[PDB]
Design a protein around this ligand. Structure first.
Ligand SMILES: [Mg+2]
Ligand SMILES: [Mg+2]
Ligand SMILES: [Zn+2]
Ligand SMILES: [Zn+2]
Ligand SMILES: [Zn+2]
Lengths: 369, 51, 63, 182, 204, 56, 51, 863, 76, 102
């Protein structure tokens, strides 16, 4: 009960040891010696016979297995298949990114504490804390106005609204009929273009942290989870309560620029898996891990095609038939330096047995007699 | 030009071979209406059954 | 195309009861009783005579 | 002009007016064919697994309507929106002398005991499509994905076998220290 | 919301639709005219002249509160559908009780009707079609549509009434497959002839 | 201690091809089939002299 | 096609511009170019004319 | 004797002159309409293309004759367009007079050592290449020519300059000649080339300036008969046409300028020969305006098929091949001592009979056609060593294929079982891997020839060897529909098969003689056979497994396990013990694809011969049960009484008024807007959820007033095409019809259909069917359903575009990756992409649903 | 205010001494240039202070093999 | 039923063509190349040409002409057309004062 495991670590891979220990120990039926020996022999038999056979072509099979369910695959915006495409093809800004911000060991169990965070990261311009806009009469020009509701549940008030004058091109002051008035007796800024004022003046507001929009909260097993409608990971960490050990964001690159490359790989795998699972179909994690490893190789996440993995070096022939590529195959071949191989398409184009499959086996037989 | 289904206007498939594979086929073929768009790019607003 | 000589499912004589069938119904006599007066037991054999079309009265006038 | 007699053989395509396409799977002798106590022998037997998955009630209703039509003598009006509500053809079918349920008692032509259930038998209008196997089958004395499949399995020899060795194999002599074809 | 305009189209390519005009609750022209229609009194042209049937293009149909059936004819309904079963086209009319099926299935069957085998030309043995088909013993579909008789499908059908049984026998009808009575085949059922004409021009 | 699938297939094919071009087959006498099945039965008896040299 | 006709096209073009201004103003609603009111069918006749 | 590698580089003048068969000097083609043979560009000991065999010493008739190269002694050097930018990048990065890379000792030492750390990555070597370029380009004091002030270069399309000095503050631009440039590249030592993008041995810089132009062979310049001359030939004609003029002007008088003009002209012509679509170079067109397509436009710009039919009476690895197809497709079998008799009988049977042959190949190689003549004197003293092409025999290795070929499972090796009629027969459980059904689907049939190929397919691609899918840890080949229903009926609580049934039908499988059939569990009511026991007659005597069945839910979840810490009073938690089926019923949980719990276990523990057996015998088992008992769907299976009808009617009315209250509130601007979404979206979102709620409720009502123990319901709850999501649609209601998200709005300017009031946002108005497929759709509903039904057509058919393309991209990226013998996934350029595949090295096709050896299972195995 | 370090998706990065470096490169029978690589710009590298020549030993939790060690070269 | 031609033997039929109504202004959607656009097909005896009046996002408002693309301002074309006075162009666009102010 203290010896078998140790000498079993040789044919085993450590993990199965922890599991086995867990079973044969936690079983109120503690067997004799023979049964334990037999059991370890069997588990090891399984492991040794479950290993991948050298000569396989897991690139192609992982590719096929990951691309197969796609045919059978037909607020939060979110995505589905196009998500798989976005993550596989790098893409700087994923269409409709989301953050699953967690909180540390205090705000995880308090609503009033999670709400503070929520309102503090939401980030609301002026076109959301309003209802509409109108003009004046004669020389009056214009003036602010409603609305009032977005203050009586987020918790912002007319005060820091007066604050706004943080070096603003104008900004006035007059909270009257619930509709804050704003008289501006100056130009050298605006002449009459009240249209382009959509972004600046009204949009160039910030009442909150990060450059994001709506934020929906949802509990999940005695834990409060914050859902973001976009991403700004860098400035999401500098918010009171934000658990730096658990913030998740589907927005790649940002993960690679903040956390690092390994975290980017882990994020790739995690995201692919999550999508596939939230579609119903399942694919073994090892394929996804292969693709992700191959993708985060080189020191930076790069797209799976043309401007990334398919685009990189292989052998000239793997880019020689790169579809009539003037500025490529003409460019690649116009640089005559070296050339290797032991590829795949190069050998089939040339009439050689591909080095995958059986091709990686060599026979031998003494001929007497 | 009438036998090849390619008009002068650069348009093609103006005339087809009257599909005769059974009776219903021909009648349906005479009452067929075609749009002149792209055979590849997706026209989501042109394909949906309009009211 | 002139009554499928005999029948398909019930495969017995039925062509020989074409004319009198048609002509009997061509006076107002409901076919579902005319058939009964003749050798028309099961409906499978009845169908072959019910839903026939005799297209031939078009095709001959040719070659 | 040449005519070719064509008997509905194994593989030909058949389909009703309900998008219920199918291929003849086996031609079984009428003897082995099961018969209903009323004397009816099926012309076409469709698997019961091609109905609840799809949602085509119109085919079943059409079966019942064809049964009623065969019995009564009426041709039955199935015009959209204005045809007999199914339950009326169901309620008439019996007074004509048949279970409302479209099903009857069928006997197994092989062994002989009648099946311990009721068998939905109807008269549905099937259309023969122009997809005759006589014009599909042909033999000879494979692109990207078709390469990738052999690659996935790992059949290299089989690849070469199919794409080269059986076409234009050309032999050239390469110099050893030169690299230029001799 | 603040403009009133009046458009008049009298062009050369507008797609209209005939409708029974309904002033108040009473649709224009009643049994008085149906009685005469069944007779050789008033043709349909005489009808459009009289003022019962009216051609509405899209633009004019914009100002219309159409009543489905003649039973819901309130004093607001502008027009009245003669027959909603005419919504679909000629091939979709071949499907019996289409309102009891799914849209995709109806699409399949309707588009598949143009593949059925039968007589589509009384003059086939003189025709010179590239490839033609002729179903030996065709049959009028039982439980069909009123349209099928007017279209002339009843006069030139393409298929047969198979007495079908629903069960999996022997496991040879699984996956959409279908099992066929040998005898029925051997007696004519579902037999057809293929036609193909080759030509030879004495080129000079 | 064993072979991989690819090695098995490879060896079988090789032996079969050897048998095709002549080359007497080891213990087989009462048979009546192609060289492939001959190499296959030969393999079922583990008498195929073809060894897989593995790069290690 | 004549020089007198210019004066008319003017007005027409004006209206075209007007429509544009209206849609950017949020008082037009984008033209449903799939609505059969704005759809015209070319039958055999006019095709044969153009030929 | 096969290709190890290929090493690209740049051809030296010496090579082109040595590899040439003759010096081309006469600028002419064939000429003309009779007698096409000259002494410059055409077959002057160079190549054969007409039916006349004469050639360059090698004779070698037009049939089979590899083309021979030629050369052209260029009167003057000519810059190669392909190297122009490279030549430039070289010139202003190195020193004239010197030959050095304008780098300090230190710089070279540490640069080369930073150049070896990158010696494989083509992408990352260019960064440092250009960086080096710019670092040298800024200097003017090289360490190997006492520094003489370097006049920066200019370029393009093929011209070079040097802004030298002679006056003082001047910056005149001395022109650059190909002779000068080439002779200036010939100084750069072999030591400096590695620091650039060149080689000392493979690609010398001086060779970038062509001194001899290699002429393509006759075989590469075929004439396209009507003759449509070859473009290459024409442009070549122009090139020699100027070349000779140039040489003739150099030999004679030398006004310099003349030679310059002619030189630059020659330059133009060669530039066009290399690339007609170049930049800054007027495309040399043919007398029609149609541009000549040269080199840069040149390298740019045994099977069968038929319908399929089912056959659960053939082995799972077998394929039904129509004997006519078998008589066309043949196999090469060399006559040996074991088939001497067979093949002789085959060839004697001729192309007729059934086991006949069509061709015979004698050892010389001459093919003999058995048609004509007779099989008599042909089939004589064949002797060993010949080859017969015999018709397909029962058992031959054959590839079965169905397009589209998604996963690998789309092409599988089968065993020919020759049968009449005219379709391919596929055993039913092998339908999921092919994704085939029947309606009209056709498949491909391949017949491999070389013994190596056949074997390889038979050893590695055989059906039985791929029951489990590599995508997920589970079986792909299994029960489909009736197999599931049959497994249920066979393993039911009330499953009592009289002797007549058991005895006669076990012949669909096998296995009895002695201690198998025994002994009739029930003689209570009558001597009879319990279905559990009959099923038990297949599983091996040691598989003990237990997993909850599909019905182990709702308040019928329960439990009541009991571990070993024998009677039988259980039902749900399927318990099989040493082949004995104690408790449980067979369904989608028990058999079928996708699952991962029984068929999975018998293939891990006993993979090839057993797995196929259990599969093969079970189908025929399950099928005969279904067949002999009667299995159907009637029309009454979906019928509900009046009570359920009145109930549903009241429910849909409730939902209607719920929507109206929402609308009346929206009209009066009674606000209440959702947090995130826009006001207009709040209204829609609230309604959709309200109606969806009511829809599921209506369906919940429908499952109560419908007998759950008739055929149809069995299929829904069992495992043969089922889904409560569709049941609700058939009996209760279809629900809200949507278009790309939002409701059905696209219609008239004020509404969807002309039967509603303008602006009516009611339930029925914006496309909501209240009736199901049973009760029948109204005129409006039928149209709405059609508008909503167009979705499935467009969506499912559009997804193919992105699926196929995306997959094609990642396939063309990973197709090179393999598992090396050291258990490592490496790219074809020797780059460890993954130390030990998938981290653990366990093939997903061979792992227990992702787990690297299902530990809890292995431990239990202690009996 | 704490730090990154073995947190959300961050594995145990360590630096290799010459010994384990040479031995590791000897085991897998490969050259220095054949390893996956990191950049000096990589945050996780600058935090651990990695120089263009180090081979980071990365220890991550794998939901299949549990604990896995990867290796990469710091570059630019 | 007829409705088809017999050319060279084979029965040729003209498939009815669904075109967007000729001679008409239609305001396109938004932000593909630049905000809102109106589109006008116009037909005259065989030839058919297009005339867009796109209002791009700064109020320039151009017009397209068949002969060589390069758009010109609405007012340029309007004055070259036949409208001289600014009151003419302005009031020709619309008689509405507010719209006139733009
Ligand atoms: Mg299918
Ligand atoms: Mg199919
Ligand atoms: Zn009968
Ligand atoms: Zn030669
Ligand atoms: Zn120098």
């Amino acid at each position: 009960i203290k010896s078998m495991v140790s000498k079993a670590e040789l044919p085993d891979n450590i993990k199965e040891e922890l599991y086995a220990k867990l079973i044969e120990y936690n079983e109120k039926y503690k067997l004799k010696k023979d049964e334990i020996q037999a059991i370890i022999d069997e588990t090891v038999r399984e492991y040794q016979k479950a290993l991948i056979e050298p000569g396989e072509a897991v690139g192609t099979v992982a590719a096929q297995s990951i691309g197969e369910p796609s045919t059978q695959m037909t607020i939060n915006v979110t995505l589905g298949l196009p998500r798989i495409i976005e993550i596989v093809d790098a893409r700087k800004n994923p269409s409709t990114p989301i953050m699953t911000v967690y909180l540390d060991e205090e705000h995880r169990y308090d609503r009033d504490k999670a709400l503070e965070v929520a309102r503090r990261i939401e980030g609301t311009t002026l076109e959301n804390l309003a209802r509409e806009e109108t003009i004046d009469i004669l020389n009056m020009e214009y003036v602010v106005e409603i609305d009032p509701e977005r203050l009586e549940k987020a918790g912002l008030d007319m005060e820091k609204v007066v604050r706004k004058l943080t070096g603003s091109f104008k900004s006035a002051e007059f909270e009257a009929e619930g509709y804050t008035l704003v008289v501006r007796p100056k130009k050298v800024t605006k002449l009459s273009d009240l249209r382009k004022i959509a972004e600046k003046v009204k949009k160039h507001r910030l009442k909150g942290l990060s450059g994001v929009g709506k934020t929906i909260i949802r509990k999940e097993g005695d834990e409060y989870v914050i859902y973001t409608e976009g991403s700004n990971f860098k400035q999401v960490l500098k918010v009171p309560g934000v658990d730096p050990t658990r913030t998740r964001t589907n927005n790649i690159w940002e993960i690679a620029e903040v956390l690092g490359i390994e975290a980017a790989r882990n994020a790739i795998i995690d995201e692919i898996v999550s999508t596939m699972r939230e579609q119903g179909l399942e694919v073994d994690v090892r394929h996804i891990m292969l693709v992700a490893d191959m993708m985060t190789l080189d020191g930076v996440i790069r797209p799976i095609g043309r401007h990334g993995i398919v685009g990189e070096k292989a052998s000239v022939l793997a880019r020689a038939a790169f579809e009539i590529t003037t500025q490529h195959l003409f460019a690649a071949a116009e640089r005559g330096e070296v050339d290797p191989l032991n590829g795949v398409v190069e050998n089939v184009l040339i009439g050689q047995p591909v080095p995958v499959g059986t091709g990686i086996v060599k026979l031998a037989m003494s001929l007497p007699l | 030009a009438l036998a090849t289904g390619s008009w002068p206007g650069g348009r093609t498939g103006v005339s087809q071979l009257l599909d005769r594979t059974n009776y219903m086929s021909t009648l349906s073929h005479l009452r067929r209406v075609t749009s002149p768009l792209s055979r590849d790019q997706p026209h989501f607003e042109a394909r949906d059954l309009h009211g | 195309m002139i009554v499928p000589v005999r029948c398909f499912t019930c495969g017995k004589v039925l062509a020989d009861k074409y004319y009198e069938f048609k002509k009997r119904v061509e006076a107002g006599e409901d076919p579902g009783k005319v058939l009964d007066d003749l050798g028309v037991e099961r409906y499978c054999c009845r169908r072959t005579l019910l839903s026939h079309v005799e297209l031939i009265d078009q095709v001959m006038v040719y070659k | 002009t040449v005519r070719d007699l064509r008997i509905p053989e194994l593989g030909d395509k058949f389909a009703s007016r309900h998008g219920q396409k199918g291929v003849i799977g086996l031609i079984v002798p009428q003897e082995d064919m099961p018969w209903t106590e009323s004397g009816i022998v099926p012309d076409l037997i469709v698997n019961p697994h091609g109905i609840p998955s799809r949602m085509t009630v119109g085919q079943l209703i059409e079966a019942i309507g064809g049964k009623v039509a065969s019995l009564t003598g009426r041709r039955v009006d199935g015009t959209a929106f204005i045809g007999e509500p199914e339950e009326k053809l169901r309620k008439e079918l019996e007074e004509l002398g048949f279970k409302h349920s479209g099903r009857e008692i069928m006997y197994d032509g092989i062994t002989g005991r009648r099946l311990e259930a009721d068998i939905f038998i109807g008269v549905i209008y099937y259309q023969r499509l122009h997809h005759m196997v006589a014009d599909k089958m042909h033999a000879r004395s494979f692109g990207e994905m078709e390469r990738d499949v052999l690659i996935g399995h790992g059949a290299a020899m089989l690849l070469i076998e199919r794409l080269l060795e059986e076409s234009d194999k050309t032999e050239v002599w390469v110099c050893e220290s030169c690299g230029h074809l001799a | 919301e603040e403009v009133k305009e009046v458009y008049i189209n009298s062009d050369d390519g507008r797609v209209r639709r005939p409708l029974i005009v309904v002033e108040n609750g009473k649709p224009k022209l009643t049994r008085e005219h149906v009685e005469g229609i069944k007779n050789g009194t008033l043709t349909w042209s005489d009808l459009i002249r009289m003022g019962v049937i009216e051609y509405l293009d899209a633009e004019e149909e914009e100002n219309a509160y159409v009543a489905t059936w003649p039973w819901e004819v309130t004093e607001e309904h502008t027009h009245l559908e003669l027959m909603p079963a005419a919504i679909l086209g000629i091939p979709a009319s071949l499907v019996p009780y289409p309102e009891h099926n799914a849209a995709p299935r109806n699409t399949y069957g309707a588009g598949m009707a143009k593949q059925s085998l039968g007589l589509g030309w009384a003059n086939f043995r003189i025709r010179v079609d590239t490839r033609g088909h002729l179903m030996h013993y065709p049959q009028v579909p039982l439980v069909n549509s009123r349209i099928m008789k007017a279209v002339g499908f009843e006069d030139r059908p393409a298929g047969q009434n198979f007495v079908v049984a629903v069960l999996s026998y022997h496991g040879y009808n699984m996956e959409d497959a279908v099992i066929i009575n040998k005898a029925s085949i051997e007696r004519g059922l579902a037999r057809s002839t293929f036609f193909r004409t080759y030509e030879a021009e004495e080129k000079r | 201690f064993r072979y991989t699938r690819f090695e098995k297939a490879r060896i079988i094919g090789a032996r079969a091809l050897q048998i095709a071009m002549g080359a007497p087959v080891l213990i087989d006498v009462p048979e009546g089939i192609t060289p492939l099945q001959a190499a296959l039965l030969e393999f079922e008896k583990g008498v195929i002299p073809i060894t897989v040299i593995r790069p290690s | 096609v004549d020089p007198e006709n210019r004066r008319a096209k003017a007005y027409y073009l004006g209206m075209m511009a007007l429509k544009v201004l209206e849609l950017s103003l949020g008082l037009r609603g984008e033209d449903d170019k799939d609505h059969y009111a704005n759809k015209r069918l070319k039958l055999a006749g006019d095709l044969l004319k153009d030929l | 004797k096969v290709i190890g590698s290929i090493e690209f580089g740049i051809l030296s003048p010496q090579e082109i002159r040595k590899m040439s068969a003759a010096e081309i000097t006469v600028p002419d083609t064939y000429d003309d309409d009779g007698y096409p043979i000259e002494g410059g560009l055409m077959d002057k000991r160079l190549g054969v293309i007409d039916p006349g065999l004469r050639c360059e010493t090698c004779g070698a008739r037009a049939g089979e004759c590899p083309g021979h190269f030629g050369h052209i002694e260029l009167a003057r050097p000519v810059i190669h367009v392909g190297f122009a930018k490279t030549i430039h990048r070289v010139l202003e990065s190195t020193c004239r007079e010197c030959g050095r890379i304008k780098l300090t000792d230190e710089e070279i030492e540490e640069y080369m050592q930073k150049f070896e750390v990158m010696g494989d990555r083509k992408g990352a070597v260019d960064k440092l290449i250009k960086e080096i370029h710019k670092k040298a380009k800024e200097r003017m004091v090289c360490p190997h020519c006492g520094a003489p002030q370097f006049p920066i270069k200019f370029e393009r399309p093929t011209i070079y300059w040097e802004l030298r000095k002679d006056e003082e503050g001047n910056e005149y631009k001395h022109r650059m000649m190909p002779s000068e440039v080439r002779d200036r590249l010939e100084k750069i030592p072999d030591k400096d080339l590695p620091l650039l993008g060149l080689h000392p041995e493979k690609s010398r810089p001086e060779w970038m300036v062509l001194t001899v132009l290699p002429v393509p062979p006759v075989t590469m310049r075929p004439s396209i008969t009507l003759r449509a001359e070859d473009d290459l030939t024409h442009k070549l004609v122009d090139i020699i046409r100027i070349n000779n003029r140039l040489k003739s002007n150099i030999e004679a008088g030398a006004p310099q300028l003349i030679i310059e003009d002619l030189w630059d002209l020659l330059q133009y012509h060669v530039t066009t020969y290399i690339n007609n679509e170049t930049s800054g170079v007027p495309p040399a067109k043919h007398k029609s305006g149609r541009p000549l397509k040269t080199l840069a436009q040149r390298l740019k710009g045994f099977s069968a098929r038929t319908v399929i039919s089912p056959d659960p009476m053939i082995s799972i690895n077998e394929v039904g091949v129509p004997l006519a197809v078998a008589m066309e497709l043949t196999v090469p079998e060399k006559v040996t001592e074991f088939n001497y008799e067979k093949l002789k009988q085959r060839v004697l049977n001729g192309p007729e009979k059934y086991p006949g042959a069509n061709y015979v190949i004698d050892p010389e190689g001459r093919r003999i056609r058995l048609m004509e003549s007779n099989r008599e004197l042909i089939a004589e003293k064949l002797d060993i060593g010949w080859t017969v092409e015999r018709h397909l025999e029962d058992g031959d290795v054959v590839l079965f294929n169905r397009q589209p070929s998604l996963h690998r499972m789309s092409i599988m090796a089968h065993r020919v079982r020759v049968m009449p009629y005219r379709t391919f027969r596929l055993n039913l459980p092998v339908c999921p891997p092919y994704n085939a059904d029947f309606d009209g689907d056709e498949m491909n049939l391949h017949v491999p020839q070389t013994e190596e190929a056949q074997a390889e397919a038979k050893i590695l691609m055989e059906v039985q060897n791929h029951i489990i899918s590599p995508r997920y840890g589970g079986p792909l080949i299994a029960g489909i529909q009736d197999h599931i229903s049959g497994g249920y009926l066979l393993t039911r609580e009330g499953a009592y098969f009289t002797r007549y049934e058991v005895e006669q039908m076990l012949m669909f499988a096998g296995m009895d003689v002695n201690e198998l059939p025994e002994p009739d569990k029930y003689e209570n009511g009558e001597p009879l056979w319990s279905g559990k026991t009959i099923f038990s007659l297949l599983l091996p005597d040691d598989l003990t497994i237990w997993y909850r069945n599909k019905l182990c839910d709702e308040p019928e979840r329960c439990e009541a396990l009991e571990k070993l810490i024998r009677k039988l009073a259980y039902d749900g938690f399927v318990y099989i013990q040493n082949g004995k089926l104690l408790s449980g019923a067979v369904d989608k949980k028990a058999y079928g694809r996708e699952d991962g719990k029984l068929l999975d276990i018998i293939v891990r523990e006993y993979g090839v011969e057993r797995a196929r057996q259990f599969l093969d015998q079970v189908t025929k088992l399950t099928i005969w049960v279904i067949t002999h008992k009667g299995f159907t769907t009637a029309i009454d299976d979906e019928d509900l009484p009046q009570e359920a009808i009145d109930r549903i009617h009241e429910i849909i009315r409730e939902a209607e008024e719920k929507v109206q209250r929402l609308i009346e509130a929206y009209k009066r601007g009674e606000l209440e807007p959702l947090p995130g979404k826009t006001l207009e979206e709040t209204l829609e979102s609230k309604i959709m959820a309200v109606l969806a709620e009511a829809r599921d409720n209506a369906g919940k009502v429908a499952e109560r007033y419908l007998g759950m123990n008739n055929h149809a319901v069995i299929m829904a709850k069992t495992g043969a095409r089922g889904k409560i999501l569709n049941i609700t649609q058939m009996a209760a209601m279809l629900g809200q019809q949507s278009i790309r998200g939002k409701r059905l709005y696209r219609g008239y300017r004020g509404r969807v259909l002309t039967h509603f009031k303008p602006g009516d946002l009611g339930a029925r108005a914006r496309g909501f069917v209240t009736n199901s497929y049973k009760s029948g759709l109204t005129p409006q509903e039928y149209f709405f359903h059609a508008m909503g039904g167009r979705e499935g057509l467009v969506d499912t058919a559009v997804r193919t575009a992105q699926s196929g393309y995306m997959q094609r991209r990642l396939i063309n990226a990973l197709q090179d990756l393999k598992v090396d013998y050291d258990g490592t996934v490496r790219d074809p350029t020797g780059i460890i992409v993954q130390f030990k595949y998938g981290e653990d090295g366990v093939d997903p096709m061979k792992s227990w649903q992702g787990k690297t050896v299902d530990v809890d299972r292995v431990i239990v195995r202690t009996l | 205010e704490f730090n990154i370090f073995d947190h959300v998706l961050v594995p145990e990065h360590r630096i290799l001494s010459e010994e384990e470096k040479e031995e590791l490169l000897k085991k897998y029978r490969i050259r220095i240039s054949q390893l996956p690589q990191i950049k000096a710009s990589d945050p996780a590298v600058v935090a651990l202070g990695a120089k263009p020549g180090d081979v980071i030993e990365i220890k991550r939790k794998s939901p299949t093999a549990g604990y896995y060690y990867y290796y990469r070269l710091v570059v630019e | 039923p007829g409705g088809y031609f017999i050319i060279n033997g084979s029965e040729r039929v003209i498939v009815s063509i669904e075109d967007l109504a000729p001679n008409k202004t239609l305001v396109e959607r938004d932000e593909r190349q630049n905000k809102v656009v109106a589109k006008v097909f116009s037909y005259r005896h065989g030839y058919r040409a297009l005339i867009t009046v796109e209002r791009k996002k700064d109020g320039i408002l151009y017009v397209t002409i068949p002969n060589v693309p390069k758009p010109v301002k609405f007012v340029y074309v309007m004055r070259a057309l036949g409208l001289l006075t600014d009151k003419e162009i302005v009031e020709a666009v619309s008689d509405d004062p507010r719209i006139q102010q733009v």
